[PDB]
Amino acid sequence: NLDIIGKRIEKIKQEHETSWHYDQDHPYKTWAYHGSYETKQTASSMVNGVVRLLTKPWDIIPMVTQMAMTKEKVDTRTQEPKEGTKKLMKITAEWLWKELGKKKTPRMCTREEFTRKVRSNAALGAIWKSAREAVEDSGFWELVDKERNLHLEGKCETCVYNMMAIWYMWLGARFLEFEALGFLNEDHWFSRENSLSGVEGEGLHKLGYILRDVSKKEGGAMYADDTAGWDTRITLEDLKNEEMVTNHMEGEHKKLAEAIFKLTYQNKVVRVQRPTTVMDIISRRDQRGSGQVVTYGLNTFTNMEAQLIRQMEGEGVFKSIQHLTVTEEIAVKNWLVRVGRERLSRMAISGDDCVVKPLDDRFASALTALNDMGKVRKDIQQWEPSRGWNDWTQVPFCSHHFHELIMKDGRVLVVPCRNQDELIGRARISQGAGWSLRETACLGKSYAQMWSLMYFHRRDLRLAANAICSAVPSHWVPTSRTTATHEWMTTEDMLTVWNRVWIQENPWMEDKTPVESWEEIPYLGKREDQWCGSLIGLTSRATWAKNIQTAINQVRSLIGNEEYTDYMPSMKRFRR
């Protein structure tokens, strides 16, 4: 408690010595409250006018238009798991870090690597003006140094979370987290090659083929149970099992990683804005509160662990979570050594998101360990058996489903898909202030090129993508303010990129014959396109398509006298 967090609390107290007060009307129940102090400040979703002017039919669709308009779970608690559950998790976690570590070497990430990431724009949940200035000033690195030596001494002064769920920290605390734990992401510990259940660094063009490969295994239904508020269900036992990665480290690295887990993950200090405007300095031990990239890898680790244990329960490897006998321990260890890697291969796991094809359907009602670990399912009663999926093309994963699409030449594409209102609504939205017309156009072009690569099979998106690319100057570079593999972020011909991604580099495509034109690239069936939200069939959509050059010309007239390319004749209907 206060020995580990007291120093951080002490420091904040004095910078606001004029404002400190133990408020008696504090709303916190599960979060430890320490004090308050005076502040005055806050974010809306702004519309992308280039995308909206080229998607007129969607201006009257509320599921699109409502997307641009407009903490009772963070303040909740999770009970301590039983002794049998704690044993299953420790055995499984010990085994899993060893498997992940067989072909990888833990290592520190460097100021050079950190500096390069900030100078190429990447979300570091951070709070000098921007990060680029701090990384160039040596005063920063001396603050970083002072904290670094405090961590080697087993103490913390400045690693404090700023709520807004995204846990922003000052750039220095972000650096120390990256130095100790960045290797999990930088060296791809959760790649499918290295973790068997992971998909880290797999583009949306890979995920469907991965689910189809899981479907080929003999076994029961495919299960895709969502957890209710995963980050809030991470227990102190989960944090202790994640910490065991430090058992694989040495020297300075081992000490620096032990401090991140001990001082910042297992004992957090947070500042929250409460209107009543006051700053609430609160603490707690449990729950996920890390940088988004470390959060992703540790969520993947703990989900892999939790799902192997649910598979053990279904297969009868242990009888009760109350307590593991001595021989159940050896049975669990022996299961992991004998079939653990095969059982990992039966899963696709992306942080809190999973798909599992178990040995049989006993898994559906194997719920005691899952509930006792705190990983309570969404939208179902605690003890009701899970509903599985009989067809891999129906399974939800990473906000998508996947279609099997046969090209006129017989070759098979497995493509990503989601309701089209969600795709159009998201492309019509931008975040942050000070967007020029050129920057807004380049963000529209990023969405368009993503649609041409991932969603070419949706009639409306291939047409709207061609229109946006026709309306934005041909040499202007696609941009995003926040950056899976983003192959659409390029000024290369998108037909050349399509061929590279779907044919040349696609390990599921044996015939490498290049496609010569967009007319060789198929769509979903007309009825399937309509099922997944297409407006084909509506008079509004027909007027848009027939008059698209008028919409393209409206946007070109706003941007002004620039060099443009007409991409519409790459489509049959505009090709004479």
Ligand X SMILES: O=C(CCC1CCCCC1)N1CCOCC1
Closer residue to Cl ion (CB): 394 or 399: 394
532 among annotated binding-site residues: yes
CA proximity to 416, closest of 457, 448, 466, 461 = 457
Contact 466, 568 (CB under 8 A): yes
Distance CA 240, CA 266 (A): 8
Nearer to Zn ion (CB atom), residue 252 or residue 566? 252
**CA proximity to 28, closest of 274, 391, 327:** 274
394 binds, among Zn ion, ligand X, Cl ion, none (CB under 5 to 8 A by kind): Cl ion
Is the CB of 95 or the CB of 455 nearer to ligand X? 455
Q: How many residues belong to the site for Zn ion (CB under 5 A)?
A: 5
Report the residue number whose CB is nearest to ligand X. 542
Binding residue per annotation — 151?
yes
List Cβ neighbours of 184 (8 Å cut-off, separation of 6 or more): 190, 245, 294, 297, 298
Q: What are phi and psi of 407, to 5 degrees?
A: -75, 155
Least Å distance between CB 498 and Zn ion?
19
Give the C-alpha distances (Å, rounded to integers) separating 107 from 113, 186, 245, 336, 525.
12, 10, 12, 27, 50
361 annotated to bind ligand:
no
Phi/psi region, residue 351 (left: phi>0; alpha: psi -120 to 50; beta: rest), is left
**Does residue 299 have a known ligand-binding role?**
yes
Q: Does the annotation flag 248 for ligand binding?
A: no
Q: What angle do CA 506, 512, 515 make, to 5 degrees?
A: 95
Q: Residue 155 or residue 500: which is nearer to Zn ion going by CB?
A: 155
Smallest distance, Å, CB 397 to Cl ion? 14
CB 214, min distance to Cl ion, A:
14
Q: Which is nearer to Zn ion, 109 or 156 (CB)?
A: 156
Residue type, 213: D
3-state DSSP call for residue 318?
Answer: coil
As measured in angstroms, the least distance from the Cβ of 536 to ligand X is 4
Name the binder of 389 from Zn ion, Cl ion, ligand X, none, CB < 5-8 A by kind. Answer: Cl ion
CB 554, min distance to ligand X, A? 22
- The residue among 25 and 379 lying less far from Cl ion, judged by its C-beta, is 379
Residue from 417, 450, 471, 494 binding Zn ion (CB under 5 A): 417
Q: From the CB of 207, what's the least distance to Cl ion, in Å?
A: 18
Is 188 among the annotated ligand-binding positions? Answer: no
Backbone φ and ψ for 403, nearest 5 degrees, come out as -110, 145
159 binds, among Zn ion, Cl ion, ligand X, none (CB under 5 to 8 A by kind): Zn ion
Q: Does 159 count as an annotated binding residue?
A: yes
What does the binding site for ligand X look like in residue numbers (CB under 6 A)? 459, 526, 536-537, 539, 542
Q: Is 201 annotated as a binding residue?
A: no
163 interacts with, out of ligand X, Zn ion, Cl ion, none, CB within 5 to 8 A per kind: none
**Ligand-binding site membership of 230 (annotated):** yes
Whether 155 and 7 have beta carbons less than 8 Å apart is answered as: yes
- At a CB cut-off of 8 Å and minimum separation 6, what does 322 contact? 82, 83, 84
With H, G, I as helix, E, B as strand and everything else as coil, classify residue 404: strand
Breaks, C-N > 2.5 A, in the chain lie after 42, 70, 127, 164, 276, 483
Angle at 267 between CA 262 and CA 270, to 5 degrees: 135
Considering only 93, 135, 156, 332, the residue that binds Zn ion (CB under 5 A) is: 156
Within residues 529-558, the interface with Zn ion by CB under 5 A covers: 532
226 among the known binding-site residues? yes
* 108, two tokens: 């520190």
Residues 6+ apart with CB under 8 A from 435: 46, 443
* Nearer of residues 95 and 389 to Cl ion, judged by Cβ: 389
Distance from chain centroid for Cα 88: 27
By the rule CB under 5 A, 344 interacts with Zn ion:
no
Q: Convert residues 116-155 into a mask of x (bound to Zn ion by CB under 5 A) and - (unbound).
A: -------------------------------x--------
Residue 26, annotated as binding a ligand: no
Q: How far is the CB of 46 from Zn ion (least distance, A)?
A: 29
Are 386 and 377 in contact, with CB atoms under 8 Å apart?
yes
Q: Which is nearer to ligand X, 56 or 212 (CB)?
A: 56
Residue 356 exposed, middle or buried by CB count within 10 Å (0-12, 13-18, 19+): buried
Looking at beta carbons only, is 451 or 488 nearer to ligand X? 451
By a kind-dependent CB cut-off of 5 to 8 A, residue 417 interacts, out of Cl ion, ligand X, Zn ion, none, with Zn ion
Helix (H) or strand (E) holding 343: helix 326-345
Any residues with CB less than 8 A from the CB of 484 and at least 6 apart, and which? 201, 202, 203, 204
- Indicate the SS3 state at residue 86: helix
- By the 8 A CB rule, do 489 and 451 touch? no
Tell me which residues in 383-412 interact with Cl ion (CB under 5 A): 389-391, 394
* CB closer to Cl ion, 289 vs 388: 388
Contact mark string toward Cl ion, 10..49, x via CB under 5 A? ----------------------------------------
Smallest gap from residue 417 Cβ to Zn ion (A): 3
In this structure, are residues 479 and 443 in contact, taking their beta carbons and an 8 Å threshold?
A: yes
Question: Is 229 annotated as belonging to a binding site?
Answer: yes
Task: Please report the DSSP string for 136-161 in residue order.
Answer: H-HHHHHHHHHHHHHHHTT--SS--E
Nearest to 51 by CA among 424, 533, 544, 572: 424
63 CB neighbour count, 10 Å cutoff:
14
388 is in an annotated binding site: no
Query: Of Zn ion, ligand X, Cl ion, none, which one sits near residue 526, judging by CB under 5 to 8 A according to partner kind?
Result: ligand X
* d(C-alpha 143, C-alpha 315), whole Å: 53
C-beta closer to ligand X: residue 37 or 451:
451
Nearer to ligand X, 526 or 575 (CB): 526
CB of 163 to Zn ion, least distance (A): 18
Known binding residues for CTP are: 229-231, 299, 378
Known binding residues for Zn(2+) are: 147, 151, 156, 159, 401, 403, 417, 532
Contacts to Zn ion by CB under 5 A: 147, 156, 159, 417, 532
Contacts to Cl ion by CB under 5 A: 389-391, 394
Known binding residues are: 147, 151, 156, 159, 226-227, 229-231, 299, 352-353, 378, 401, 403, 417, 532
Known binding residues for Mg(2+) are: 226-227, 352-353
